[PDB]
């Protein structure tokens, strides 16, 4: 299995990682129907989502997706530091696919 | 998809954001039948709930109203400052579509 | 839909409310068969429980009774003060239905 | 239903109250195949287990199992102090029943 | 049942203690398909997984994979000092079977 988000992220097509180094600037949860989304923000500019669940998805990736937006609230709340993402760059906002944080 | 709760509430009918930016003042939960639903206050004065799961609600947004209330009692735990809301106005007390916080 | 706890307990039979204004004394919980069950006390003597899942519940009782015990123990934990209870009265200790918190 | 984790504790056979009064020292959770478990120590040198859920559990208990896990993680992290448990001690180590902790 | 990781860690096959006496250095959380994992690294260089479920996985491991996660992003966020970790060696990187962390 890949050893650090980056060698994680050259496995797939359509990713790249991003170099954060910063806490979330702003949380936004959605529960309005085909909408139920997180996206944050980044007082660089960026921002990103964890998308709708759907067919670009597989079974495995369903409490995966639960869990991503469960760690990005947490991290918002605590102000944790954000290493890199690994997002998906066909998709607007772009798409994360994994995040790191460091200590 | 939407990078903003104001372009996300747009998307729908019978909606529209409040400016909070505040803390919680309140935090009400409800198991009781037929009334399984979170409502939250602000010294405003203003009042939402989160909507008790029904026909009005598709498939993919019974796990993100668990999310919602999930969100709205930590952040009432974290004294956390919401910025906007987005609401169904055609509910009493307003009904919560989407929340953003910044910091 | 109610705006407060005192509306929503008004809603229902064998109902009333406690004033606590208190942090919780002791929590309470247990696995063992036929008591899945959580109990709280305050310094005023009052006992409160949420009652194990029988079938005096509806069917969108049951994940808010796991959300009601959650509350319960993060409230607990973070010595966080109870507004009010809606208890229901014919049952021992008084079974909880709705707890408010305010700030 | 039972006031006290005592009342509660002698409802069972192969019971009986631990009185701790401490925080857990340390916390062990395993995923391995057959032993899904927690153990706990404290410094007086008792160790305590959450069972791997079996036969001996009925479906009601399935939930709370999961539950008493979470309260000793969270217990442990926030250096909570333990009043009693409630232990099986017809399981080595002895099985935790039921847990309280007062302020 | 064991009483201690280590006495755990010796039932199988193809595992090892590690004494970490360490918090946590980085977090990765990944949500792309065939990579749902946690990797997290120490200051030492050493680094582990908890692996993507599979056929090496029986059903009653499913919830405590879920759990051992959720536990290592608590861990990391709160600095919270691991004690040892149980890996399997036959995997890379190293695979988390049980942890534990003392006070
Ligand atoms: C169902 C089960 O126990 N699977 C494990 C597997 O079991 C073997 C039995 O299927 C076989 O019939 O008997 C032998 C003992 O004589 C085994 O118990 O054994 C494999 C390989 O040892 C285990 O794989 C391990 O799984 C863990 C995760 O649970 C981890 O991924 C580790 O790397 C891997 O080797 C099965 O657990
Ligand atoms: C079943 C399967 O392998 N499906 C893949 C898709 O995952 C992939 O689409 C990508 O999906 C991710 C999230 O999983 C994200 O939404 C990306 O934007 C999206 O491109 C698709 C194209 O690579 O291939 C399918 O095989
Ligand atoms: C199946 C479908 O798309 N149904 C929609 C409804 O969502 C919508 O009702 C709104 O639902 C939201 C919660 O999702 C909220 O309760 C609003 O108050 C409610 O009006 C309905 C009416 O506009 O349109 C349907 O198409
Ligand atoms: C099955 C059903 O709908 N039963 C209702 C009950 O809700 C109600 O009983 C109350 O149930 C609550 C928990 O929901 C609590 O346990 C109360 O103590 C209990 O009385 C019953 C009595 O009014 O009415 C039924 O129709
Ligand atoms: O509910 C679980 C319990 O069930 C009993 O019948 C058993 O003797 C106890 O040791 C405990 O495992």
Redesign the interface.
């Given at each position: 299995?890949?050893?650090?988000?980056t060698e994680?992220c050259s496995?797939?097509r359509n990713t790249q990682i991003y170099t954060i180094n910063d806490?979330?600037?702003?949380?936004?949860?959605?529960?309005?129907?085909?909408?139920?989304?997180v996206?944050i923000t980044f007082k660089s500019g960026e921002?990103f989502?964890?998308?709708?669940?759907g067919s670009q998805?597989?079974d495995?990736?369903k409490?995966?997706?639960?869990?991503?937006?469960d760690?990005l609230?947490?991290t918002?709340?605590?102000?944790?530091k954000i290493?890199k993402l690994?997002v998906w760059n066909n998709?607007?906002?772009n798409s994360?696919?994994?995040?790191?944080?460091?200590?």
């Amino acid at each position: 299995a890949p050893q650090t988000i980056t060698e994680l992220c050259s496995e797939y097509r359509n990713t790249q990682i991003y170099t954060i180094n910063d806490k979330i600037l702003s949380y936004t949860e959605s529960m309005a129907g085909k909408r139920e989304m997180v996206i944050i923000t980044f007082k660089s500019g960026e921002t990103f989502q964890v998308e709708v669940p759907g067919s670009q998805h597989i079974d495995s990736q369903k409490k995966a997706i639960e869990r991503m937006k469960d760690t990005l609230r947490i991290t918002y709340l605590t102000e944790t530091k954000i290493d890199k993402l690994c997002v998906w760059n066909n998709k607007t906002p772009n798409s994360i696919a994994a995040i790191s944080m460091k200590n």
